[PDB]
Design a protein around this ligand. Structure first.
Ligand code: MG
Length: 564
């Protein structure tokens, strides 16, 4: 059980093993009930690595703890070994947060990693499973590589595997495996799930300033909800053990294979337990993370909700409370196109570049690799820095703690001050789920044709009292300044002279039929307007959005599925 044979298994190809930008995500049953399904996909990844580079290569491997993950890691090891891959670094018990994997790939200069996560999607025997491939910069495999893996998956006929190799995932250290009639060994190193990521955070943030903030009778009282996913141990070992926060601060911080039977997806409904806890008024700061730790929700005293578009703006405005940025400086700011323009106000005032990208990581990564991007955020609960090449939920929480420690204000008072200084970008996202594809497609084509007409710029819409004048309308296009690529049809933008925007996108998910995403960003600068209810302040533009798009007529929906 340390000396294993290499064998070749004939297999039948599948046709649907397309890695996408976030990994191949299938129902767990599919993986269990489809012969060699996982085997085929893992082999197809490894086949992208030139056989001459495998011995010297290391792959980082870990996941979010969901059901089926360890069985997948075992067969990843069995296949990487047979294929001549030299070394695997695997998090203890298979557990590695997505930011941790990106951390470790970059630190040890691995060729890439394979993350066993489906992020926010439910886990368990009746849930989903995902296999994500990252490359040597720590970030997601780009299109040209995922295309290759797809190609190989569709015509694969055999894979190589040591069926007898079994890694003990529970014990730290190097396990060596001697392969029959192979000179070099195959080496697995089990590493503590948290250490290398904690060591990175210890250099990024002022752990002494934070321990002071979090400890003692005058402590900042926090509740940090890992939603039964991967970031749990990271919370316990960093916020509690190392930074001295009371152990009751770590909520749902024990990874569960079914994530507790719920979606590890941070927002005001999936994380309603945190919200109600914060509602009591006992704690100053709340936060929630998704299954793999790259998304985060930020809550203040009494459940005050910092929406992700605002969060990245507040961090930008106070970025030098964070030692990493004092020493790198601020290379640039970025948000996805549908994210609110609050960040732009900070970037304009402090005169730092604001990159407005299509949705998707690759655009942030390219700018990061160019040394042009320090801080990025997305309206979908995503905040990141160029410290790694994934977004990082716990990083965003420690950024907020750093800012709370230097500001010595509540979360809410910080936001009120932010809104008084930069004005407020009220923001909401409307989700229309599983509308008929023909109707949604017609809605988009009709709206775009309407926007394209020479008279549309300048058109006026009463609210009333307020008049919105369209300054610009288009289907968003982005020419990437690094890889040369052009991304078209990235979303319909109605840009108004007052700084406000309406944005329509069709969701790229594989759900039954289309999902419509309507983003409303209404800028207000006035004192009597910036502390009103957001949904009340957004209602005029919501009315304009639905009228100009004829959404109800094209879909039959009188209300969104979700309001965020
Ligand atoms: Mg995620």
């Amino acid at each position: 059980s340390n000396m294993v044979k290499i064998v070749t298994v004939k297999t039948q190809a599948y046709q649907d093993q397309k890695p996408g930008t976030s990994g191949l995500r299938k129902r767990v049953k599919v993986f269990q009930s489809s012969a060699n399904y996982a085997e085929n996909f893992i082999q197809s990844i490894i086949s992208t690595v030139e056989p001459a580079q495998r011995q010297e290569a290391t792959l980082v491997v870990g996941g979010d703890g969901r059901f089926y993950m360890k069985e997948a890691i075992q067969l990843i090891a069995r296949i990487a070994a047979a294929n001549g891959i030299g070394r695997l670094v695997i998090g203890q018990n298979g557990i590695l947060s997505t930011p941790a994997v990106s951390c470790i790939i970059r630190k040890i200069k691995a060729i890439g990693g394979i993350i066993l996560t489906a992020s926010h999607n439910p886990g368990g025997p009746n849930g989903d499973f995902g296999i994500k491939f990252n490359i040597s910069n720590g970030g997601p495999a780009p299109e040209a590589i995922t295309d290759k893996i797809f190609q190989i998956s569709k015509t694969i006929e055999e894979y190589a595997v040591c069926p007898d190799l079994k890694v003990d995932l529970g014990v730290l250290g190097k396990q060596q495996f001697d392969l029959e009639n192979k000179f070099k060994p195959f080496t697995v190193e089990i590493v503590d799930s948290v250490e290398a990521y904690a060591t990175m955070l210890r250099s990024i943030f002022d752990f002494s300033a934070l321990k002071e903030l979090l400890s003692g009778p005058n402590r900042l009282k926090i509740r940090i909800d890992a939603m039964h996913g991967v970031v749990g141990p990271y919370v316990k070992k960093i916020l509690c053990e190392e930074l001295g926060a009371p152990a009751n601060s770590a909520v749902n911080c024990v990874p569960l294979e079914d994530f507790g039977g719920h979606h590890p997806d941070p927002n005001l409904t999936y994380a309603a337990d945190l919200v109600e806890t914060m509602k009591s008024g006992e704690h100053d700061f709340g936060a929630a993370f998704d299954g793999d730790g790259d998304r985060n929700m930020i809550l203040g005293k009494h459940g005050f909700f910092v929406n992700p578009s605002d969060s990245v703006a507040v961090i930008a405005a106070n970025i030098f409370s964070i030692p990493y940025f004092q020493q790198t400086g601020v290379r640039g700011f970025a948000r996805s196109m549908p994210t609110s323009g609050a960040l732009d106000r900070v970037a304009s005032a402090t005169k730092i570049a604001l990159y407005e990208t299509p949705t998707g990581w690759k655009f942030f990564g390219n700018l990061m690799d160019a040394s042009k991007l320090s801080l990025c955020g997305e309206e979908s609960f995503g905040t990141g820095s160029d410290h790694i090449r994934e977004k990082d939920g716990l990083w965003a929480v420690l950024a907020w703690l750093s800012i709370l420690a230097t500001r010595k204000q509540s979360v809410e008072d910080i936001l009120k001050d932010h809104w008084q200084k930069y004005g407020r970008n009220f923001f909401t996202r409307y989700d229309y789920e599983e509308v008929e594809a023909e109707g949604a497609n017609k809605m988009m084509k009709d709206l775009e044709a309407l926007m394209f007409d020479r008279s549309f710029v300048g058109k006026q819409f009463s609210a009333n009292d307020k008049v919105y004048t369209v300054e610009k309308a288009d289907n968003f296009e982005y020419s990437d300044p690094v890889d040369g690529s052009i991304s078209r049809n990235q979303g319909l933008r109605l840009i108004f002279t007052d700084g406000s925007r309406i944005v329509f996108r069709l969701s790229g998910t594989g759900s039954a039929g289309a999902t419509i995403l309507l983003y409303i960003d209404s800028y207000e600068k006035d004192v009597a307007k910036i502390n009103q209810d957001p949904q009340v302040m957004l209602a005029p533009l919501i009315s304009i959005a639905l009228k100009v798009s004829q959404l109800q007529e094209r879909t039959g929906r009188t209300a969104p599925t979700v309001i965020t």
